[PDB]
Design a protein around this ligand. Sequence first.
Ligand SMILES: O=C(N[C@@H]1O[C@H](CO)[C@@H](O)[C@H](O)[C@H]1O)c1ccc(-c2ccccc2)cc1
Ligand SMILES: O=C(N[C@@H]1O[C@H](CO)[C@@H](O)[C@H](O)[C@H]1O)c1ccc(-c2ccccc2)cc1
Ligand SMILES: *Cc1c(COP(=O)(O)O)cnc(C)c1O
Ligand SMILES: *Cc1c(COP(=O)(O)O)cnc(C)c1O
Lengths: 810, 810
Amino acid sequence: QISVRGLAGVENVTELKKNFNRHLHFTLVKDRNVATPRDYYFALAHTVRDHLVGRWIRTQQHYYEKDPKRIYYLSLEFYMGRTLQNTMVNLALENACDEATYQLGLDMEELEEIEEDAGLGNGGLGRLAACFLDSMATLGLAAYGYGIRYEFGIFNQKICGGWQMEEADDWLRYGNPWEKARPEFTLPVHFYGRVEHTSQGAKWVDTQVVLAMPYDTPVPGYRNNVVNTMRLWSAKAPNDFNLGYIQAVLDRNLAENISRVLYPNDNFFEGKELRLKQEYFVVAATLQDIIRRFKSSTNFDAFPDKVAIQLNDTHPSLAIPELMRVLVDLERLDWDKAWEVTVKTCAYTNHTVLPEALERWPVHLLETLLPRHLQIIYEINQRFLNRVAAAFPGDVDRLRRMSLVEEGAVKRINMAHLCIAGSHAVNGVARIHSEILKKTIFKDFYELEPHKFQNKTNGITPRRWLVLCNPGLAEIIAERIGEEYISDLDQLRKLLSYVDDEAFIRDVAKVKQENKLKFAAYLEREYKVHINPNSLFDVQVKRIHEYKRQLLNCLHVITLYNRIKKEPNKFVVPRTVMIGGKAAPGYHMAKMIIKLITAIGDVVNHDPVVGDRLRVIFLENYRVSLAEKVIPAADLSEQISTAGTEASGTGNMKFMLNGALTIGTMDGANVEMAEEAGEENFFIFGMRVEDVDRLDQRGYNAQEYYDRIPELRQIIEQLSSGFFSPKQPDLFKDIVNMLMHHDRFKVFADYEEYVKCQERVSALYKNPREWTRMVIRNIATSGKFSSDRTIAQYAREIWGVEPSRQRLPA
Amino acid sequence: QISVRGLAGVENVTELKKNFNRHLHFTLVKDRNVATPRDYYFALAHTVRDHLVGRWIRTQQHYYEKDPKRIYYLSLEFYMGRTLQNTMVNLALENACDEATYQLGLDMEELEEIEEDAGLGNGGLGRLAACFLDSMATLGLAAYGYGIRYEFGIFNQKICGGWQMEEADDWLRYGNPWEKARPEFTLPVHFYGRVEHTSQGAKWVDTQVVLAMPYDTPVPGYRNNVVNTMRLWSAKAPNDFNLGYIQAVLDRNLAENISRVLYPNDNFFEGKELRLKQEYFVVAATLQDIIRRFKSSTNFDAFPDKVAIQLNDTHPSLAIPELMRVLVDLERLDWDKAWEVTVKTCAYTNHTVLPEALERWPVHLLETLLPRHLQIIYEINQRFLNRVAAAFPGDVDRLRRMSLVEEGAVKRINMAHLCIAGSHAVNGVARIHSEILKKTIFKDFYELEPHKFQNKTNGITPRRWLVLCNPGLAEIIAERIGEEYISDLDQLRKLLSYVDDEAFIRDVAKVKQENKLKFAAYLEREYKVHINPNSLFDVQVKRIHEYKRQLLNCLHVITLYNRIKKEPNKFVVPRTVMIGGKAAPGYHMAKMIIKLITAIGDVVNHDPVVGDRLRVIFLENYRVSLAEKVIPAADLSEQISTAGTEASGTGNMKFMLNGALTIGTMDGANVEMAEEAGEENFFIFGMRVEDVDRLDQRGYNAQEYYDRIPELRQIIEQLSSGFFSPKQPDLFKDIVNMLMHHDRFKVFADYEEYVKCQERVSALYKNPREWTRMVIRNIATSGKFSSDRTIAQYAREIWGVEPSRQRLPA
Ligand SMILES: O=C(N[C@@H]1O[C@H](CO)[C@@H](O)[C@H](O)[C@H]1O)c1ccc(-c2ccccc2)cc1
Ligand SMILES: O=C(N[C@@H]1O[C@H](CO)[C@@H](O)[C@H](O)[C@H]1O)c1ccc(-c2ccccc2)cc1
Ligand SMILES: *Cc1c(COP(=O)(O)O)cnc(C)c1O
Ligand SMILES: *Cc1c(COP(=O)(O)O)cnc(C)c1O
């Protein structure tokens, strides 16, 4: 149908159809009289997986022969989404499969919708891991994703009476055709025990054993025939476990609970034992695998020449003392040499700014669970603090601040401090964030070891986030400038010479309109709610958190509603305001915010005076596959975190790539985005970081804004009085209370500038041609935010490997 | 190589090799440089499964079009063993696969050994279910096996210091290629709740839901292209289950524990709630499936014309009140019509004689778990007892004896009484057993409804138990009389005209010798123990139970040892005595018997005066695939249960088919076996049933035998004094105590006749030609004990369907 989706050759189509029918018959054990659409999806999925297999085998063979330096991306989260369409895109198979399935009387798009998301992540950090795997394969890096195969991913969100209800994401119920169990590579992981000291050093004994069984998932690069591996570990009990009889067999589940469920918190540390077990489990099994692969290339001096281990936040920070344990206790290297190897191997990416997001594990937990690792940590700390003392003699406070061990009622290990000490590189995820790490959060560490601190600004894969989710936009771009941009996104700058081309202006606006019609129809069939597709699509999608300030958006929504009610016969630009995201099950305030959003919708969407001029929709179950639908349909991207709180953001980049304008603060990657596009093509508002600090010094008094802004006072009275909750008039008194007395994120401080900037957006939307010309300037300068750029920088400045765009043989 | 294993055509072999390599590449994602032998097995298993698929689809299609009466075999146990070789045999693929694999440089026999047994059964009852499925497919019956897919089957037995240790049978660790998950046919099963009575009858409400997910396994008939289905249910939690958050997800395991593990007791009732849940789970899910299939053929009068439900013991007896519940509460039939339908649909096979084997469920358990079923049971009982009263007016004792409800400290439901009341047929499993049911155990029920009681003598499939496990014997038979006997085992009578043919005598003895050499070598490689293969192979394999009298065998073994030590320079026929079997984990006495066996071995096998004349081997981990090796190697089959205690036995039949002579009591099917072969070709000894009764009436005094038999007294003193346990002299005092004061099974009463009969066996073994002529007379009259005969009788006399040997099209 469209060029970027590849060729549908007569021999390709014939062979796909034949293999589809072979899989339906032999693999699925169905004929066409009893086949459900689910069977059709599985037949297609198996048919496409078959095209991966030879490339996957030959790529793993190639790495054995060449023996390149190997990159191990350790993460507790991989937010992969669906695999079928992505696999088709990267193998140039999409049109051929479309044609093949069409000839069998099937709609491929309908079959694609049957696939479960692999929702093994919470949000940005997990999705970054996924984009990164794609980019590493596309740049021909010998890279391995290592994580946990959770039986239950991020929960499925249902809305019941406007409240979030959580249900279990049983994503493996029907089978995962993309994974391959590798039970032959099963490895023991140890827990508990105690440490004996002998003649020949320390010995970790009397441990409980849990087995780690790996599952391999292919990660195809973009049309280069490279297929890398994501290896996810599953927990299995050994067969002698607890071995009255029946109960011993049933208790096998205690050990297997390790890989049962993803912890569903965004930027919040919960110090639970099960979570610690997950962290050690992935680290122990992965390091044995890395070391085994290294011995099949005595001499651990070459280990950092052949191995790079990237730590995706502190969640796998135990890799550091585990590598030390293996090298010292098992391989019998002296401490100093082992430490040299460890520091040169490991690198740490920080994603965090809020102090409640930092992992600080109670010492009593580590003492019980990982007694040897605690000893190694203490030894690391002592030696580290001796360097600090020698560099800053007499600075006793610095010693206390920099310690890996925090004193207090409960002693804790600061895992971030551990990562900095034991890594040769520490990076933030956007320029402003990496600067904040150097200036404030890790200032002391920066002064000791300035050379460690880098920036690597985040990115997104333009395969999933453009070609896959927005084929129509990809095509019109490809008509003008060719297909090379898909793996070299900087080439989008060539679109700047089309900013005054009427045909291209018309095509860009037409694709957007088509995407809005398609998303409006999706809301009709799946959720039975009607939206005006001529309205401006004002979208805020991301996890629900106070720092992300969905509440600021709510205040604007209510402001528009009250303005309409005040002057009902005045023209306003119509809006559909869509807000979506999951709240962590324990985060009471996030759950109240969801309830406020749906309660606003209950008033606004049923007011006959409003009409189709304003609609508020809570998008249920926001996940990777919903982002693929809603982002291409958006006009306005809401990126409105309090300055200094969003480390980078990546949603922001997805929207920029797909033809939405951005309203946002100078936070995270918004700053770099505005810099690339020009500030005049960005709706910037609010306090800068420096303004937030000035406010903190003198003190944030929310009452002052309430006293001075009549429009704001009205909204607070409506919330307080039960205007949005007539049956329970005090329902939202916690939200009012927080805003007035305990707001860490200064919602009122940015209110006035936000509402005003929102008026400028509405004004620009009245002029479709100039709106679209500004959109083109955004898309045209989105190139920097390809994860290919990001990974090339990791590769050159941290891992010490050159990326390649050369194809392996087919 | 040999004719009964089928043709190895050039096109067959070429196509198998090509598909083996396709599966190795695409299915397993390996090349030949990294493939483990496990991969080779899986590639072969997938290659063979592909030949099942079209027949399986076409057979299920054929049953939809013809709409024959359907047989549902409900069992909590299916002891299937390995599937690969059986599938090859029944598809005539064995030689072609042998050739194909040989040309790829692989030994098929080595690959076969990698397959895990499906050990979803304890012993005879479970193995009967498996043989029956094979026979039902071979006789072209529209039959379905329904059970539970246990994650852990019968435990793997290890011997440690002569003691049994149990470990978990993690048979699904590497995947089961033979099953096909059918998540689309998932069904709810209810537990707990309470009963509301309304205008429109009873309503079972406030229940907990567990999902039943079916897995289908193909059951090929012998070369008829029929492939029937075994459907096993797995327990799954619903996604709203317990839905703080993390704990709710982890608690999903409580519901899924239902299908976790097989209860490992042989002829012993343990009234545990989890076991009751298993029984209801298989019954509820199966009956919904039966009813759904029946509605795709209002009118439940035709239900017994289209459905037969066979109850394999009382374990699925809840089918009776569940069928009533569905018909009365959900379909709104009146009670009497529903009961007519139920009785005509259901039939009950009894396997039991010992009172501790009968299921008697406490009323408080049923009250909590299945409150509606308890009501239905009470109503069934009341109406049943009104019939008894009217037929036997004034016989108050009969009412008490026949009640489904047993009075006592704890009130109980007798499930056997329920089965008799609610079934149109009740059968025992051998003639003597079925007579004992009529004369003693269910005498009262027989007097009420004589027409219900039948016999169906057990059998064994000669596919697995001859062609598969003893190809060499099958071949020499086939040289003389052709291949037709494999599905018409009565044809073995033609071998009686070869009883004086020297060539056939030599061939029969040669095959036996080859099998003994092969089994002797197996003990060498896998268990490092050396046996004289010129010795008589004296084998007792079966579960460890007091009633089976392994202890009687031990007494004989010790007798021979003491006779040798008394007169060391006298000739004795050499013996290897092999005893094998698992003890139930809680059965202390069974575990002591294992320990005694290995302790006898410790003395006997290391005495230099004994030499290779006597060896005692405990065969570890007795299971279906070990029976396939040891049974063809046996000379003497030990079937020595106290008369009246072994309902049938089936091991006995396996040995007779494979060229062993039998030493045994007139118990179970031994009686019919001796009758078929002639008593002169059988080593019969001991008390008959009538003799046991005479002993019980006057009282069993073990001391009397101890006082009168010097050889027995010596053995008891050796056990008591620590002769077999020098380090713990009192180790076996529980065994001595039981034998002397509390022996239910009268071991000493049969001792003298057993030892004497054992001397006659030794005498016949000195004359190889006459030994082999007697063997031929046994094999030649083993035809009756084909499960094909057994199933044809179930079919005609209980289910009302004609078996067919006509082939479906290929
Ligand atoms: O997703 C996260 N962070 C996001 O990372 C992306 C990618 O760099 C940034 O764009 C974004 O600004 C930032 O918020 C995240 C971080 C820590 C935990 C966590 C988990 C367990 C315990 C403690 C914290 C859970 C989630
Ligand atoms: O395997 C069994 N019985 C055997 O059945 C075969 C086939 O008919 C006969 O040849 C043999 O004589 C007889 O012993 C068996 C019966 C009940 C339970 C059981 C399970 C749970 C609770 C209570 C009893 C467990 C096992
Ligand atoms: C990109 C993405 C995120 C992260 O978005 P932010 O706006 O950076 O928080 C979260 N969830 C999903 C499903 C995504 O696709
Ligand atoms: C046939 C068989 C049995 C039953 O044997 P009995 O001698 O009748 O108890 C038990 N276990 C296995 C593995 C079998 O093959």
